[PDB]
Design an enzyme around this catalytic site. Structure first.
Site, PDB file in Angstrom:
ATOM      1  N   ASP A  61     113.327  58.523 -21.050  1.00 17.02           N
ATOM      2  CA  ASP A  61     112.206  59.266 -20.445  1.00 17.02           C
ATOM      3  C   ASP A  61     112.577  60.693 -20.119  1.00 17.02           C
ATOM      4  O   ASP A  61     112.621  61.080 -18.951  1.00 17.02           O
ATOM      5  CB  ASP A  61     111.605  58.521 -19.245  1.00 17.02           C
ATOM      6  CG  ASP A  61     110.123  58.927 -18.895  1.00 17.02           C
ATOM      7  OD1 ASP A  61     109.452  59.494 -19.745  1.00 17.02           O
ATOM      8  OD2 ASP A  61     109.630  58.686 -17.747  1.00 17.02           O
ATOM      9  N   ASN A  69     113.025  53.397 -16.055  1.00 17.47           N
ATOM     10  CA  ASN A  69     113.568  54.352 -17.001  1.00 17.47           C
ATOM     11  C   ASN A  69     115.036  54.121 -17.284  1.00 17.47           C
ATOM     12  O   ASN A  69     115.673  54.945 -17.944  1.00 17.47           O
ATOM     13  CB  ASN A  69     113.311  55.813 -16.559  1.00 17.47           C
ATOM     14  CG  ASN A  69     111.876  56.213 -16.712  1.00 17.47           C
ATOM     15  OD1 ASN A  69     111.131  55.603 -17.513  1.00 17.47           O
ATOM     16  ND2 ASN A  69     111.475  57.248 -16.028  1.00 17.47           N
ATOM     17  N   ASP A  98     113.006  62.009 -13.152  1.00 19.60           N
ATOM     18  CA  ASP A  98     112.214  60.789 -13.043  1.00 19.60           C
ATOM     19  C   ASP A  98     113.134  59.584 -13.167  1.00 19.60           C
ATOM     20  O   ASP A  98     112.827  58.628 -13.868  1.00 19.60           O
ATOM     21  CB  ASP A  98     111.066  60.769 -14.020  1.00 19.60           C
ATOM     22  CG  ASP A  98     109.976  59.801 -13.612  1.00 19.60           C
ATOM     23  OD1 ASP A  98     109.977  59.280 -12.491  1.00 19.60           O
ATOM     24  OD2 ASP A  98     109.081  59.595 -14.426  1.00 19.60           O
ATOM     25  N   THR A 132     108.082  60.393  -9.821  1.00 22.38           N
ATOM     26  CA  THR A 132     107.428  59.155  -9.392  1.00 22.38           C
ATOM     27  C   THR A 132     107.561  59.087  -7.876  1.00 22.38           C
ATOM     28  O   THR A 132     108.657  59.301  -7.350  1.00 22.38           O
ATOM     29  CB  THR A 132     108.085  57.955 -10.068  1.00 22.38           C
ATOM     30  OG1 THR A 132     107.887  58.038 -11.461  1.00 22.38           O
ATOM     31  CG2 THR A 132     107.501  56.641  -9.555  1.00 22.38           C
ATOM     32  N   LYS A 163     114.562  56.138 -12.281  1.00 24.13           N
ATOM     33  CA  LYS A 163     114.009  54.973 -11.621  1.00 24.13           C
ATOM     34  C   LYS A 163     114.306  53.778 -12.507  1.00 24.13           C
ATOM     35  O   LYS A 163     114.604  53.942 -13.689  1.00 24.13           O
ATOM     36  CB  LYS A 163     112.477  55.081 -11.402  1.00 24.13           C
ATOM     37  CG  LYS A 163     111.666  55.383 -12.654  1.00 24.13           C
ATOM     38  CD  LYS A 163     110.205  55.490 -12.332  1.00 24.13           C
ATOM     39  CE  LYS A 163     109.374  55.832 -13.532  1.00 24.13           C
ATOM     40  NZ  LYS A 163     107.910  55.845 -13.238  1.00 24.13           N
TER      41      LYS A 163
HETATM   42  N1  LIG Z   1     114.363  52.763 -26.945  1.00 26.09           N
HETATM   43  C1  LIG Z   1     113.630  51.727 -26.516  1.00 26.09           C
HETATM   44  N2  LIG Z   1     113.986  50.462 -26.712  1.00 26.09           N
HETATM   45  C2  LIG Z   1     113.233  49.463 -26.217  1.00 26.09           C
HETATM   46  N3  LIG Z   1     112.098  49.628 -25.518  1.00 26.09           N
HETATM   47  C3  LIG Z   1     111.685  50.862 -25.293  1.00 26.09           C
HETATM   48  C4  LIG Z   1     112.436  51.991 -25.773  1.00 26.09           C
HETATM   49  N4  LIG Z   1     111.830  53.111 -25.384  1.00 26.09           N
HETATM   50  C5  LIG Z   1     110.747  52.742 -24.701  1.00 26.09           C
HETATM   51  N5  LIG Z   1     110.647  51.414 -24.619  1.00 26.09           N
HETATM   52  C6  LIG Z   1     109.551  50.661 -23.932  1.00 26.09           C
HETATM   53  O1  LIG Z   1     108.301  51.105 -24.444  1.00 26.09           O
HETATM   54  C7  LIG Z   1     107.414  51.456 -23.322  1.00 26.09           C
HETATM   55  C8  LIG Z   1     107.788  52.864 -22.877  1.00 26.09           C
HETATM   56  O2  LIG Z   1     107.233  53.769 -23.589  1.00 26.09           O
HETATM   57  P1  LIG Z   1     107.177  55.354 -23.610  1.00 26.09           P
HETATM   58  O3  LIG Z   1     108.418  56.168 -23.372  1.00 26.09           O
HETATM   59  O4  LIG Z   1     106.367  55.441 -24.850  1.00 26.09           O
HETATM   60  O5  LIG Z   1     106.073  55.583 -22.440  1.00 26.09           O
HETATM   61  P2  LIG Z   1     106.255  55.395 -20.837  1.00 26.09           P
HETATM   62  O6  LIG Z   1     107.326  56.362 -20.437  1.00 26.09           O
HETATM   63  O7  LIG Z   1     106.395  53.919 -20.471  1.00 26.09           O
HETATM   64  O8  LIG Z   1     104.777  55.725 -20.409  1.00 26.09           O
HETATM   65  P3  LIG Z   1     104.128  56.990 -19.673  1.00 26.09           P
HETATM   66  O9  LIG Z   1     104.260  58.084 -20.716  1.00 26.09           O
HETATM   67  O10 LIG Z   1     102.740  56.409 -19.534  1.00 26.09           O
HETATM   68  O11 LIG Z   1     104.946  57.282 -18.413  1.00 26.09           O
HETATM   69  C9  LIG Z   1     107.991  50.812 -22.085  1.00 26.09           C
HETATM   70  O12 LIG Z   1     107.738  49.435 -21.916  1.00 26.09           O
HETATM   71  C10 LIG Z   1     109.463  50.982 -22.417  1.00 26.09           C
HETATM   72  O13 LIG Z   1     110.266  50.146 -21.642  1.00 26.09           O
END
Ligand SMILES: Nc1ncnc2c1ncn2[C@@H]1O[C@H](COP(=O)(O)OP(=O)(O)OP(=O)(O)O)[C@@H](O)[C@H]1O
Ligand SMILES: CC(=O)CS/C(=N/c1ccc(Cl)cc1)NC(=O)c1c(F)cccc1Cl
Ligand SMILES: [Cl-]
Length: 286
Positions: A150, A137, A132, A172, A134
């Site tokens: 991710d 991520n 994934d 994606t 992109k």
């Molecule tokens: N280590 C980090 N530092 C800063 N921001 C982060 C970090 N990890 C995730 N985020 C931010 O928090 C949110 C991402 O969250 P998370 O991995 O919980 O779910 P997601 O991958 O966005 O969602 P989904 O599971 O719906 O695909 C996004 O806005 C992401 O950019």
């Protein structure tokens, strides 16, 4: 160290929310260190069949130890929640910058592409497919180096069986490989396809296969139906054309094409010093 607990932290702002998670900025009381803590509600993970993805995220991230990835420092749980203690990527998603500036100049395209290549070389060397990849991520730390994230949909290929193909359908639409669509499996080279899409997006401002409906995107992917804008750095165009190849065994960087040496040797990267990239000052994004 002592296993951490929620009360060992003070939480600040919500940094983001996913479908099954909330990421919060946190300070650890005993050390004053800052972390991004990703928090998931067990009842929701259980009800919605997400346990394998949460355990995969933990397992994959626990294997990684490279400067271009978000670091998993610790995990803990209580009766209601799972917690991942992550490095805080203060500058957020790469996508934000593409949107705001529209595209990247050649120097910035080259630098960020090289970091992604370096990251993929490490990941693939460990037998892990991201699946994934992109701009959403690819996070950015305070120093504007990349921090790929991710991993719940990544795959550790088994070394014991010399596994090359992974069977789960994840990804994606804009970045998914043709092999996953037509053969129903992905391979390390599927990430190289995503890389080609990302390079195109940095230069052109949009990914190459795009539509308002996923199925329309799939139809273009499988036909290699895309075009370049009239002005597109020529050596970057050549690189994209060597990555966006339907046959996954013919992408520059793949194992059948003899790996990352030929990819790092591409003319687009002639000025890159690969060995200390993470200690170089990134070019300013304008
Ligand atoms: N280590 C980090 N530092 C800063 N921001 C982060 C970090 N990890 C995730 N985020 C931010 O928090 C949110 C991402 O969250 P998370 O991995 O919980 O779910 P997601 O991958 O966005 O969602 P989904 O599971 O719906 O695909 C996004 O806005 C992401 O950019
Ligand atoms: C002990 S093993 C473990 N079992 C689960 C996994 C999912 C659910 Cl709904 C409940 C228990 N989970 C974890 O250790 C764990 C963590 F404590 C923080 C983050 C991610 C994970 Cl997988
Ligand atoms: Cl999940």
């Amino acid at each position: 160290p002592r296993k951490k607990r929620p009360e060992d932290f003070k939480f600040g702002k919500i940094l983001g929310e996913g479908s099954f998670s909330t990421v919060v900025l946190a300070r650890e009381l005993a050390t004053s260190r800052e972390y991004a803590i990703k928090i998931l509600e067990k009842r929701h993970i259980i009800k919605e069949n997400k346990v394998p993805y949460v355990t995969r995220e933990r397992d994959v991230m626990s294997r990684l130890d490279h400067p271009f990835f978000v670091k998993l420092y610790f995990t803990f749980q209580d009766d209601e929640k799972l917690y991942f203690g992550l490095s805080y990527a203060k500058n957020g998603e790469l996508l934000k910058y593409i949107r705001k500036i529209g595209s990247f100049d050649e120097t910035c395209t080259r630098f960020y592409t090289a970091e992604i290549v370096s990251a993929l070389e490490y990941l693939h060397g460990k037998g892990i497919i991201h699946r994934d990849l992109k701009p959403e991520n690819i996070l950015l730390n305070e120093d504007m180096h990349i921090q790929i994230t991710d991993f719940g949909t990544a795959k550790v290929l088994s070394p014991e069986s010399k596994q090359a193909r992974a069977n789960s359908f994840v990804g994606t639409a804009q970045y998914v490989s043709p092999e996953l669509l037509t053969e129903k499996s992905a391979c390390k080279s599927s990430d190289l396809w995503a890389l080609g899409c990302i390079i195109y997006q940095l230069v052109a401002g949009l990914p190459p296969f795009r539509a308002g409906n996923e199925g329309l995107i799939f139809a273009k992917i499988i036909k290699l139906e895309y075009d370049f804008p009239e002005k597109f750095f020529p050596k970057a165009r050549d690189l994209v054309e060597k990555l966006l190849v339907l046959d996954a065994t013919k992408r520059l960087g793949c194992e059948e094409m003899e790996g990352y040496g030929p990819l790092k040797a591409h003319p687009f990267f002639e000025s890159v010093t690969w060995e200390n990239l993470h200690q170089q000052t990134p070019p300013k994004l304008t």
